[PDB]
Write a protein that binds this ligand. Structure first.
Ligand SMILES: [K+]
Ligand SMILES: [K+]
Ligand SMILES: [Mg+2]
Ligand SMILES: [Mg+2]
Ligand SMILES: [Mg+2]
Ligand SMILES: [Mg+2]
Ligand SMILES: [Mg+2]
Ligand SMILES: [Mg+2]
Ligand SMILES: [Mg+2]
Ligand SMILES: [Mg+2]
Ligand SMILES: [Mg+2]
Lengths: 136, 59, 158, 291, 168
RNA sequence: GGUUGCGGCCAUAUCUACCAGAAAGCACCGUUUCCCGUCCGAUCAACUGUAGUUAAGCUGGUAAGAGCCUGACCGAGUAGUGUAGUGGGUGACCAUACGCGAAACUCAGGUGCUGCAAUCU
RNA sequence: GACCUUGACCUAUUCUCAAACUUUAAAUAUGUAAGAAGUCCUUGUUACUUAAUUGAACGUGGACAUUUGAAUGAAGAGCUU
RNA sequence: UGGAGAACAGAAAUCUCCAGUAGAACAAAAGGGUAAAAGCCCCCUUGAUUUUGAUUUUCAGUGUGAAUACAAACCAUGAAA
């Protein structure tokens, strides 16, 4: 998925996150006396509806990302689906919701991700962290 | 009339093992180091009492 | 090999509740047990003496004996195809009065009043409880409550 | 003193009175629990507590609702019996112990039956039960967080209560007079302490060496014309008066409950609603809105 | 401003960490005994080290705590050796302070060759009135923030009362 | 209403930072002959309420405070699950029928109540 | 000390997990109760217990009976060798 | 355990203050339990005793082991409960 996206759009055109970590150890035996296996390798247990991979891009670059994910599907067993999210990037906000919160001063950058103003906690420390809110 | 009072232990530790502060890697290397006449008397193992204990080489 | 000690399999059962460790509050010691009282057994893991075996956790029985620190309780344990009577010596920290009985007695009292009240007033009263009954008929107006039509929703992704 | 939310969340508070540093629950359990085959027989503690400035002796029993005072007796009463000074000393402790005993036995109607020791020669004895007649009223000394030491005042109040006719089980080895080597009590020394001998001897010794200090301390004794040698007569006359009329007699009370409350209401700050709380925030954002 | 918040010496602690356990430790005990006028207390090793040459429970070091007037006296005798000059470093964040002397003769003791020579740690603990609140048995509290001893506060006091310098 | 002693339930009571506190109480605070205990009258003991002080403790109040507590047709009738079919699907699993039904989340509110005795503008 | 940069550490965030982790916490399964061997009143016995003429346990005498204390069923119920 | 301080003394010696819900310890596995303690130090001791019964686990409701609550003694400790 990476290789394809970097060729057709360039290495800085997307952020790809693998959203499953293989924590479950597989055993292998190698008669049936004393058959408890030894560790063989590792695997990730996925549910129905569980996100395997996520990609954020500019909306220009939809077709590329969709293709790169399409190419990745052939490496996995079972059926996966490719879904366009209603959310903004890797946030938990619908694209209009995020925009309104950014038009107000309620969002601040925190490296790759973001911090939101809560209407809660000390008033002093909120005004440090979110100056552009309140000012209005 | 001599007398000897000893401080009672409050600690629970009864394994003869030093704490995790005691880590040679944590040593600061940028030290003054007493040089000159300062260093001479402060440097233990630099006297006749030290030499006279050591056994003589057979050369 | 297998292992079946007296407290095998109690890891969670005898743990204290979260943020409820430490000293037993004094009301536990000021409760008064009398022969015939119905008690519920629930081991306090902080009091290792006088402790019930895990089988009796959550069992209710009758006090048959009272001593200095403790009560004797009778429990019926199923063994095979029959119930044997078991007699346990429990310290009071592992016991509490069953509220099942406390709320039955309130009904015996309330029934007595009702029955007395009924004779002097000179009529006849129903003292048995009844199961919840089928609802009777009822008129529901639409004044400020005209029915609002719902339809099933289409599939969306999220 | 910061504490993380996780630390705060998981913390288990001690009981309120352990936080306040007042109740030793370990002791309390052992004091209060009755034998379960005695049913609702209350155990009675003789609670003795020294503030600075006052001795409090209360006879208390327990109940799930809370403890219940049977009787009480404060050293600030003792002026009524002609002790005006050293109201937190060993001799006053004895007197307050004698008072609580005599007051309780009068309330239980048991004061003729159990007189006590009327003589007072500083002798170790418990109250022996009368043959063919009620047993003495039994109470246990509850000294709270006070340290047990030989000659502490708290065993003074004990001695007074025993000598007043309460059965208060005790040993003699923490009275002033207990010789630690030979393991016997000296009644003379205990007797002196009951009548403030240790205070009298000190006034004698000091109105001699440092007359400057004897005026600073003992100012109140000079002012009332009380020589050291009279102390034994104060406490002797005090005991006699205690035994004659132990019955409690409250203060007169200038002003009533409602009047007292009205005055104190005026110095208590009140909570700020939820609308006032809101308005104050709105005002605070408005300040930082400009600048 | 209020007299109840005026600093004083809680206590002075004199400490001699002799490495050895044997003769030299009993000699250091004698030094503190004559200086303090009190029987001093010996500390035992928390654990074996090897490089220092000490074993768990060996019985190295001795110390003694002095309070009241004789703390004031012994402190003066100690500050004479320092020439009334402590560093800013010597003051702790909790507003105690300490210094050290090589050679206990400099305080003012006749030498005696059987005993020998010893350095010391002087450690001085400061508090205000009402510190009993933390120390007593019943109703044990904490000192309020305003009433805590501070580095800033202790230094000002040390300069003002003793007429000393504080360097760096 | 305040305060003390002894409490009940054991955070709506805890924690952090600030501010206020009449009266009384409580407290800090003064002293080292005596009983007593310490390396050290610091703690513990005793003595005086006399020399001083609300500075601290304590009590209350403040905070789009942290924590905790309560509620909600908030999320969610979701997850899970008892029972049913010669239901679907290669399977993995899933839907439906008759029942039971969370936790996180979100929002709103709250922040000790109270017993016995004594005492106080 | 002066800074540019890589590990460490702290603070606020972020993706993902647990048969032998857990604040929380189901469904199903599971103990007890739903009365005459009861309830209330009255006052006898004791060497136990109480400071006690208090209790505890067992009683006397008295009162309350079919709507006597939820539902459904009961082909008889109980006991022994 | 961490922080900040103190001659030699340093990452680690000993002293001091502050923070510290147990992150320690409790012979020995693991789990549970415990903070004016069940941990640490100190004081005194021999209830690690006598006489036999009842009870819980394993269960046949046998034995053995282990354990629980009383009785009748005699003791230890503690001012005492
Ligand atoms: K695939
Ligand atoms: K057995
Ligand atoms: Mg097993
Ligand atoms: Mg045992
Ligand atoms: Mg005690
Ligand atoms: Mg003092
Ligand atoms: Mg103030
Ligand atoms: Mg079928
Ligand atoms: Mg099951
Ligand atoms: Mg058997
Ligand atoms: Mg076995």
């Amino acid at each position: 998925a990476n290789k394809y996206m970097t060729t057709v759009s360039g290495r800085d055109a997307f952020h790809l996150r693998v959203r499953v970590h293989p924590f479950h150890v597989l055993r292998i035996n190698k008669g049936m006396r004393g058959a408890w296996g030894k560790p063989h390798g590792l695997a990730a247990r996925v549910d129905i509806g569980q996100i395997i991979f996520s990609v954020r891009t500019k909306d220009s670059n939809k077709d590329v990302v969709v293709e790169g994910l399409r190419r990745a599907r052939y490496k996995f067993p079972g059926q996966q689906k490719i879904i366009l999210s209603k959310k903004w990037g890797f946030t938990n906000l619908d694209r209009p919701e995020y925009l309104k919160k950014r038009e107000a001063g309620e969002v601040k950058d925190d490296g790759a991700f973001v911090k939101f103003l809560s209407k809660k906690g000390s008033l002093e420390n909120n005004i440090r962290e979110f100056p552009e809110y309140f000012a209005a | 009339p001599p007398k000897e009072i000893v401080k009672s232990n409050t600690s629970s530790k009864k394994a003869d093992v030093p704490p995790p502060s005691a880590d040679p890697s944590k040593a600061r290397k940028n030290r003054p180091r007493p040089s000159g006449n300062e260093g001479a008397i402060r440097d233990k193992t630099a006297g006749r009492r030290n030499n006279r204990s050591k056994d003589v080489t057979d050369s | 090999g297998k292992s079946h000690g007296y407290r095998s399999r109690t890891r969670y059962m005898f743990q204290r509740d979260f943020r409820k460790h430490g000293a037993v509050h004094l009301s536990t010691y000021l409760k008064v047990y009398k022969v015939g009282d119905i008690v519920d057994i629930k081991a306090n893991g902080s009091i290792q003496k006088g402790m019930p075996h895990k089988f009796y956790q959550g069992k209710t029985g009758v006090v048959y004996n009272v001593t200095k620190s403790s009560v004797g309780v009778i429990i019926n344990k199923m063994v095979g195809n029959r119930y044997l009577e078991k007699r346990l010596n429990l310290r009071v920290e592992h016991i509490k009065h069953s509220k099942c009985r406390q709320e039955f007695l309130e009904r015996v009292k309330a029934n007595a009043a009702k029955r007395a009240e009924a004779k002097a007033q000179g009529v006849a009263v129903q003292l048995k409880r009844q199961p919840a009954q089928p609802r009777e008929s009822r008129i529901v107006s639409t004044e400020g409550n005209v029915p609002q039509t719902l339809a099933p929703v289409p599939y969306e992704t999220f | 003193d910061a504490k993380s939310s996780a630390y705060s969340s998981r913390f288990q508070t001690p009981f309120r009175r352990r936080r306040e540093g007042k109740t030793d629950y370990y002791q309390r359990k052992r004091l209060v629990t009755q034998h379960k085959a005695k049913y609702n027989t209350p155990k009675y503690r003789l609670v003795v507590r020294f503030t600075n400035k006052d001795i409090i002796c209360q006879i208390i029993s327990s109940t799930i609702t809370g403890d219940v005072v049977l009787a009480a007796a404060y050293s600030h009463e003792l002026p009524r019996y002609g002790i005006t000074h050293g109201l937190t000393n060993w001799a006053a402790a004895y007197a307050t112990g004698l008072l609580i005993a005599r007051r309780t036995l009068q309330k239980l109607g048991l004061d003729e039956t159990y007189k006590g020791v009327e003589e007072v020669e500083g002798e170790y004895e418990l109250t022996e039960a009368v043959e063919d007649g009620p047993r003495p009223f039994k109470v246990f000394l509850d000294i709270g967080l006070q340290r047990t030491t030989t000659g502490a005042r708290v065993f003074g109040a004990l001695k007074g209560a025993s000598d007043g006719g309460l059965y208060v089980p005790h040993s003699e080895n923490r009275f002033p007079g207990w010789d630690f080597e030979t393991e016997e009590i000296d009644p003379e020394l205990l007797r002196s302490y009951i009548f403030g001998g240790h205070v009298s001897q000190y006034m004698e010794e000091l109105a001699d060496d440092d007359e400057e200090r004897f005026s600073e301390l003992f100012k109140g004794y000079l002012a009332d014309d009380i020589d050291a040698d009279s102390l034994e007569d104060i406490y002797t006359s005090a005991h006699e008066a205690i035994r004659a009329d132990p019955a409690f007699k409250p203060t007169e009370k200038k002003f009533t409950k409602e009047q007292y409350a009205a005055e104190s209401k005026k110095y208590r700050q009140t909570k700020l609603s939820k609308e006032e709380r809101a308005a104050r925030v709105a005002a605070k954002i408005a300040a930082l809105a400009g600048q | 401003q209020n007299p109840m918040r005026d600093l004083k010496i809680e206590k002075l602690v004199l400490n001699i960490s002799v490495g050895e356990s044997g003769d030299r430790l009993t000699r250091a005990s004698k030094v503190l005994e004559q200086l303090s006028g009190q029987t001093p207390v010996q500390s035992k090793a928390r654990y074996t080290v090897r490089t220092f040459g000490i074993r768990r429970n060996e019985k190295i070091a001795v110390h003694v705590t002095v309070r009241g007037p004789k703390a004031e006296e012994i402190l003066e005798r100690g500050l004479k050796v320092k020439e009334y000059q402590l560093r800013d470093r010597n003051f702790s964040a909790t507003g105690n302070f300490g210094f050290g002397i090589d050679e206990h003769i400099d305080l003012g003791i006749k030498y005696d060759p059987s005993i020998g020579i010893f350095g010391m740690d002087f450690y001085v603990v400061m508090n205000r009135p009402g510190a009993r609140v933390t120390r007593r048995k019943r109703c044990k509290g904490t000192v309020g923030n305003s009433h805590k001893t501070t580095k800033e506060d202790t230094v000002s006091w040390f300069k003002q009362k003793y007429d000393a310098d504080v360097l760096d």
